[PDB]
Design a protein around this ligand. Structure first.
Ligand SMILES: *[C@@H]1O[C@H](CO)[C@@H](O[C@@H]2O[C@H](CO)[C@@H](O)[C@H](O)[C@H]2NC(C)=O)[C@H](O)[C@H]1NC(C)=O
Ligand SMILES: *[C@@H]1O[C@H](CO)[C@@H](O[C@@H]2O[C@H](CO)[C@@H](O)[C@H](O)[C@H]2NC(C)=O)[C@H](O)[C@H]1NC(C)=O
Ligand SMILES: *[C@@H]1O[C@H](CO)[C@@H](O[C@@H]2O[C@H](CO)[C@@H](O)[C@H](O)[C@H]2NC(C)=O)[C@H](O)[C@H]1NC(C)=O
Ligand SMILES: *[C@@H]1O[C@H](CO)[C@@H](O[C@@H]2O[C@H](CO)[C@@H](O)[C@H](O)[C@H]2NC(C)=O)[C@H](O)[C@H]1NC(C)=O
Ligand SMILES: *[C@@H]1O[C@H](CO)[C@@H](O[C@@H]2O[C@H](CO)[C@@H](O)[C@H](O)[C@H]2NC(C)=O)[C@H](O)[C@H]1NC(C)=O
Ligand SMILES: *[C@@H]1O[C@H](CO)[C@@H](O[C@@H]2O[C@H](CO)[C@@H](O)[C@H](O)[C@H]2NC(C)=O)[C@H](O)[C@H]1NC(C)=O
Ligand SMILES: *[C@@H]1O[C@H](CO)[C@@H](O[C@@H]2O[C@H](CO)[C@@H](O)[C@H](O)[C@H]2NC(C)=O)[C@H](O)[C@H]1NC(C)=O
Ligand SMILES: *[C@@H]1O[C@H](CO)[C@@H](O[C@@H]2O[C@H](CO)[C@@H](O)[C@H](O)[C@H]2NC(C)=O)[C@H](O)[C@H]1NC(C)=O
Ligand SMILES: *[C@@H]1O[C@H](CO)[C@@H](O[C@@H]2O[C@H](CO)[C@@H](O)[C@H](O)[C@H]2NC(C)=O)[C@H](O)[C@H]1NC(C)=O
Ligand SMILES: *[C@@H]1O[C@H](CO)[C@@H](O)[C@H](O)[C@H]1NC(C)=O
Ligand SMILES: *[C@@H]1O[C@H](CO)[C@@H](O)[C@H](O)[C@H]1NC(C)=O
Ligand SMILES: *[C@@H]1O[C@H](CO)[C@@H](O)[C@H](O)[C@H]1NC(C)=O
Ligand SMILES: *[C@@H]1O[C@H](CO)[C@@H](O)[C@H](O)[C@H]1NC(C)=O
Ligand SMILES: *[C@@H]1O[C@H](CO)[C@@H](O)[C@H](O)[C@H]1NC(C)=O
Ligand SMILES: *[C@@H]1O[C@H](CO)[C@@H](O)[C@H](O)[C@H]1NC(C)=O
Lengths: 171, 322, 11, 322, 171, 322, 171, 11, 11
């Protein structure tokens, strides 16, 4: 991507995570499991929803537009009418295709950005109590139960609490 | 003990295009381009269309006998013509300002066909039994249902001067014809005057017609012509006809009411018992999508027509199940 | 319109 | 000892819309949509508009007596008509090619009203005292200031043939009328000839007129009509009138000069002692903004008209005073 | 934001900093205070100014455009004229609203990017002589007077100068 | 031991504009705006243009003697007029529906000039030697190559009635003229009838003409006029002329074939032995670029015209050789 | 730039690297030299090529469009025709200039993003066996021959292989 | 036009 | 079209 997250240092997506766009996968003594991050997901949903709605809204309702007829001595007016119709058609096709392309690119880049942001948030929360084993994962220098995992997920990680143990295991 | 940060991947095969990369498989998406229609002619917001059947606008307005007569009063949402309208102008001649009349009819929502000048008797001392083979019906020679061929009676064509006062409370479309014989012999045998004239006048309208005699190439086995004219009589106004020959007098006129969002289309489809907010010549579109690639001609509340064959917007992420 | 992609969205 | 990196937040309540998120409070912004006007009719780049007062284009050009006479020579930047122009064509009849004449006047910047054919005496042996009640002024029956009703004098209407040579060095708009009596009796009592005709010719112009007698519905208590015609005499060219009846002869013509950026508007506002580079029917716009949602009709250097009710562009940051 | 700086790991903006868009807030023995970074601010100002000017310039001056009149037998030409006017109006409203939206998004993202860039610049300048205490702040492992703060601000920080003291306090 | 990560810089001076920053030097770029032309008139997809030389459309169609006669049958891709076409309508008069005829010719790809009514003898008992000084050639008084001035022979102008049947298998453009003398004396001395008339009729066409006598200002030393008329005879149809005076009869008509992508231009350039897919009045464009700022008028497959003076798209990086 | 790479913490570009857009410059005992990264370069080439092609494709071929003529009594239709032509011209000039500007900005930002992504990839590959000496360079805490340099370039760096030596030199 | 948002801009 | 900027591109 543009931010190097999706299809970057995080090679693939999780078919296991079915409850959200972005999230986590924990592994400890109590077991392993997927768990989506609801905040970022909700934000992304709101943004993209507003984008789509915003694209549909910008296009007014096309009311009644029918063709006209011209006799054998009005070829000029006929060709003018055609000029008009064809011109408008060209312009609108252009605008449509272009806008869709642009918004698609910006959308994918937006997702990428969200993933990288989440990763950096987690990283900055954990600091040196864990190590980046690559692929968007962190290996703990201490024991982390489901309560600790939850403390990490919902943005309430306690660094000094495990600081000592982590320092010891880090050696 | 480890924890990972990752993104959603599912199982979709939806592909979208971007500026940097075409054809990208993604998890979620939406299509903004409607490409489906029911191929039926439907009601528009509860109002049925006016179908002319075998006739076109001209054929119906003049009253071609080959077309099944409509109800006296009709209301519609849009007008439909068949591509192969074999019945139209059945007696050769030029229909003056026909296209402008079509445009006027495009904003008309209802008509009342009433007898403005009764056959018996608005034109005394004149023959009203004139018929022709070009406008045939059931084999027999006939004539327009809305017009009347005033000819000579007992070897004379007395100058007629009649008038109608519009007390319908709406605009009244009035149509009449002017006959043009090939030679002066027929001119005399029909209207007894080589120097005939027709005068039609209202408040805002004012026109005089003169028989133009000339041998013309056979059209529908007719070397003579018959130019058709029309006018919109405003409510309260009075239309006056005054002629001494060659007048194809009016008999039935139309009381018209104006409406919005109407129009004329040439469709091949058939009427079904259904309803829609958007109608195309190919069929009805039932969609809230912003675009459509079905047909340029649209009536009602429709998406905008484009030439695109695909308009897919991505909502989800880049789908990587690997 | 709404994107009902997950059952807990707020939409 | 610590150091922080942060961004500016102030106190603004300016809100802008984005693609991902609507209604975002920001620190700095600019509005590109002008929505204000002074509701006055102003000068345009130093030139005052031509106000027709009670008359419309037709009424002024023909010379309706009910309208206050303008100065002989006038220069303007744009033409203004009042919505309720009760004074226009005061004698019933069709003004031919009126709209094209309006379009011609849209690029005219100045006029000089001069006497092309003096009342006494350009039409000898004819009566020039003809008046009517339809074009009344101060209760009394009157007539157009620019036209003249040539009738019969001493029981005869001699064939007149006059001409004017354009030595003004500019285009000369010339207007005349053709009278149409309801019956032949009046036709004789006015022009003594049942077979009258009017011939108007220049280098590039060429038209002949014939009295069309027909009883017509009363308009402004008149069963007769009066069709109005016009032409643009090129510099150096000569216009020739030649008639034996039914000619509403010219008396005053207009010397015209062409200009750019002019036009016609229908406004309700009043003239004030002010100046602008942009003028709308609602009032003058004094703005350098690229867009405006005030009115589609604009004269001068104006912003582009849109339907938008808000076009605000963000310059500052997302304002977070928390 | 898109880069996670503004309204991200730096939650709020400074009402105290009134002299610039981006900047600093120092705290040492000599005292505390706000001080905007003039370079980045100037760059942003130039860019956005050119953007705005560029949007106003792309729109030509709308010269005289008045309506036309048509008689009772020219309804077709009338409706055609209307088709033209209405079409152009639709197109231009569309273009305006769309462009403004796009440029707004890109603008906010641009600011976010600038903030993150400044932060990363500072971080890369300080290295391991200070620690990230979160919220876009750095706590020094040594004493830093106004001269040192200024050395950091104007991009002339001396790392080996305080390297020893910092290493000692870091322990 | 060290390793670095860096980007490409070269030596280009190509500058592009962005939204945030104008005039940025970059390593690689592409220009999408074509601004070059060869200044020549070239063949279009293998077909040479129809050059009228000294004549315009009117002059060539009528057959102005001053213009070098073309081959009987010609095929082209586009029509070229010279800005200073001094040869056109050489006998003063109005060319009716001239512009519509031009528009018709814009979709015509080939013509065959054939003799529809041979000079000797399609008009017996009439003089066909009529010439004029206004249409002079080599000093001598001449006349149109395609028309014929039927006058009186031996003190009489017998009523003529001739007709042509179109068996060419294509549309046949037929042109004729109507003469208008200044006085009745000349009218008699030329056509012997003060009450002359001309009748032209086909299946779909129908028109009658009457001599309008009036003294008109001298144009090309002629106080008389000559209105020119035309029609498109459908394959199989029959055109009939029937007159007793004032008819400028047809002699040569045109068999026409329709084609696409054709048009008319006014160019000053010259024909060279070259070929192109795109042609402008300034010269031929040989480009695959999407835009061009050369000329709005284009014939063939051309880029879209814009007012831009620079459209450069960046592909490489920001070039920093420092 | 937008990502702070190009013209950011990497001040200048390499005239020496003539075989690619992005790449490396190594310095060891065996010698020094430039070497472009073919993967990222190829990706960028494909993307931008598709962009350009996509911009040229969106513009249809302008077929025959010639002017029309009107007599002295058709000034209205004439001015209408002009309205149409001028309107379409304005719209298309607008669209062209705007699109080119937007795509240029997005292009430069795309390059910047690619450079930063490559740098981060390398950094994450090397970890703590080398140090960021600024200006987008890394100084090794061990000896690195051409084989090692190549191992870094083509994304196959062996961290535990030099981990010990690096730890020793790091002290 | 200029954005005079701070008193020391260069504008 | 192709951007042949380097001799080894794949184009
Ligand atoms: C977020 O996570 C923190 C850590 O798991 C949660 O704190 C726990 O909350 C429960 C309530 O069900 C307490 O009984 C536990 O004792 C808490 N753990 C700790 C560290 O004491 C917190 O409840 C979670 N919720 C939110 C919204 O922060
Ligand atoms: C993967 O997506 C496909 C759609 O392409 C799903 O197929 C649908 O499955 C549901 C129930 O499983 C059926 O009701 C539908 O008829 C199927 N087709 C469509 C078009 O929805 C499939 O279920 C999905 N599988 C997984 C594991 O996600
Ligand atoms: C667009 O992407 C589709 C994938 O959706 C490509 O289709 C693949 O086609 C290959 C060759 O037939 C098959 O082996 C794959 O199984 C297809 N994938 C799927 C999921 O159907 C297609 O080739 C791409 N088109 C272009 C031109 O890029
Ligand atoms: C906050 O912004 C408001 C504008 O909404 C400022 O109000 C202005 O204050 C100045 C002087 O302080 C007055 O001259 C103006 O009349 C006020 N209104 C406007 C529209 O400018 C206010 O000053 C600002 N306050 C702070 C602390 O920034
Ligand atoms: C747009 O944002 C404005 C804030 O400018 C919102 O207005 C707020 O409205 C609530 C409810 O009345 C008030 O409590 C706040 O004090 C208002 N804020 C301000 C600063 O005025 C408004 O609700 C938003 N509109 C939408 C539809 O998003
Ligand atoms: C940038 O900051 C450096 C560090 O504060 C400044 O260096 C000081 O400059 C003053 C001049 O007023 C000298 O007298 C001080 O002794 C310098 N401090 C040091 C470290 O010696 C420098 O002047 C500032 N200016 C620029 C543009 O770099
Ligand atoms: C720098 O770029 C210039 C173009 O501006 C190159 O000049 C060309 O050099 C080649 C061979 O070296 C000649 O064939 C061309 O005629 C020159 N002009 C053009 C327009 O290509 C120059 O070679 C480049 N130099 C370097 C070192 O890259
Ligand atoms: C656009 O950039 C060009 C650089 O290509 C600038 O031209 C420079 O002009 C200065 C002043 O004459 C010269 O000293 C430089 O040598 C020129 N550079 C080159 C490479 O030619 C030009 O000034 C810029 N224009 C604007 C308005 O920004
Ligand atoms: C990528 O780099 C790795 C490290 O240089 C290469 O591994 C070398 O490959 C050669 C084959 O020419 C072997 O003989 C060397 O012994 C390898 N070095 C090591 C570490 O054993 C690898 O070949 C390169 N190619 C790819 C595509 O990975
Ligand atoms: C409907 O008309 C179209 C021509 O417009 C023709 O192609 C098609 O065969 C017709 N279909 C039916 C069912 O009549
Ligand atoms: C139109 O489509 C919607 C979507 O299914 C459906 O709810 C509605 O019934 C349809 N309306 C008709 C009249 O078919
Ligand atoms: C001006 O005219 C408008 C109608 O266009 C009318 O609504 C309004 O009342 C008038 N106002 C004044 C002050 O005359
Ligand atoms: C137009 O507005 C500007 C901005 O205040 C002002 O300087 C100028 O005086 C105004 N012009 C007029 C004539 O009102
Ligand atoms: C061609 O015509 C143009 C006018 O359109 C004139 O400016 C130019 O001088 C002419 N050039 C030549 C070579 O005839
Ligand atoms: C048009 O330009 C291309 C590019 O050089 C060239 O290959 C071609 O020969 C040119 N065609 C003509 C007919 O000049």
């Amino acid at each position: 991507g543009l931010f190097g997250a999706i299809a970057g240092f995080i090679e693939g997506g999780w078919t296991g995570m079915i409850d959200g766009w972005y999230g986590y996968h924990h592994q400890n003594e109590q077991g392993s499991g997927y768990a989506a991050d609801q905040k970022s997901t909700q934000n992304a949903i709101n943004g993209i929803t507003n984008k789509v709605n915003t694209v549909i809204e910008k296009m007014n309702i096309q009311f009644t537009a029918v063709g006209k007829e011209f006799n054998k001595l009005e070829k000029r007016m006929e060709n003018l009418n055609k000029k008009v119709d064809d011109g408008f058609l060209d312009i609108w096709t252009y605008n449509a295709e272009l806008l869709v392309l642009l918004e698609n690119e910006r959308t994918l880049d937006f997702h990428d950005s969200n993933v990288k942001n989440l990763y950096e948030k987690v990283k900055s929360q954990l600091k040196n109590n864990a190590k980046e084993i690559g692929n968007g994962c962190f290996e703990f220098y201490h024991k982390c139960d489901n309560e600790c995992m939850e403390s990490v997920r919902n943005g309430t990680y306690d660094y000094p609490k495990y600081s000592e143990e982590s320092k010891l295991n880090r050696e | 003990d480890t924890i990972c940060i990752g993104y959603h991947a599912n199982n979709s095969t939806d592909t979208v295009d971007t500026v940097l990369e075409k054809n990208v498989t993604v998890t979620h998406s939406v299509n903004l381009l409607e490409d489906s229609h029911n191929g039926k002619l439907c009601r528009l917001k509860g109002i049925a269309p006016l179908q002319l059947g075998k006739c076109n606008i001209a054929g119906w307005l003049l009253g071609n006998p080959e077309c099944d007569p409509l109800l006296p009063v009709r209301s519609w949402s849009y007008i439909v013509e068949t591509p192969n309208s074999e019945n139209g102008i059945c007696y050769p001649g030029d229909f003056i300002d026909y296209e402008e009349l079509r445009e006027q009819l495009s904003s008309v929502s209802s008509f009342e066909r009433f007898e403005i000048f009764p056959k018996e008797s608005s034109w005394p001392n004149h023959n009203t039994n004139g018929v022709t083979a070009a406008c045939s019906h059931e084999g027999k020679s006939s004539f327009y249902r809305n017009l009347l061929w005033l000819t000579e009676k007992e070897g004379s064509y007395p100058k007629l001067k009649n008038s109608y006062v519009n007390k319908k409370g709406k605009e009244v479309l009035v149509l009449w014809g002017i006959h043009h014989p090939p030679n002066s012999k027929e001119q005399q045998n029909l209207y007894q005057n080589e120097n005939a004239y027709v005068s039609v006048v209202t408040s805002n309208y004012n026109r005089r017609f003169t028989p133009e005699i000339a041998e013309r190439p056979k059209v529908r086995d007719q070397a003579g012509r018959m130019n058709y004219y029309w006018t919109l009589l405003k409510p309260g106004d009075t239309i006056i006809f005054e002629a001494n020959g060659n007048l194809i007098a009016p008999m039935y006129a139309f009381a018209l009411s104006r409406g919005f969002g109407s129009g004329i289309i040439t469709s091949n489809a058939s009427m079904h018992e259904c309803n829609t907010k958007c109608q195309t010549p190919l069929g009805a579109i039932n969609s809230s999508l912003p675009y459509q690639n079905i047909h340029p001609v649209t009536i009602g509340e429709c998406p905008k027509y484009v030439r695109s064959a695909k308009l897919r917007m991505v909502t989800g992420l880049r789908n990587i199940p690997s | 319109x709404a994107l009902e992609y997950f059952e807990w969205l707020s939409x």
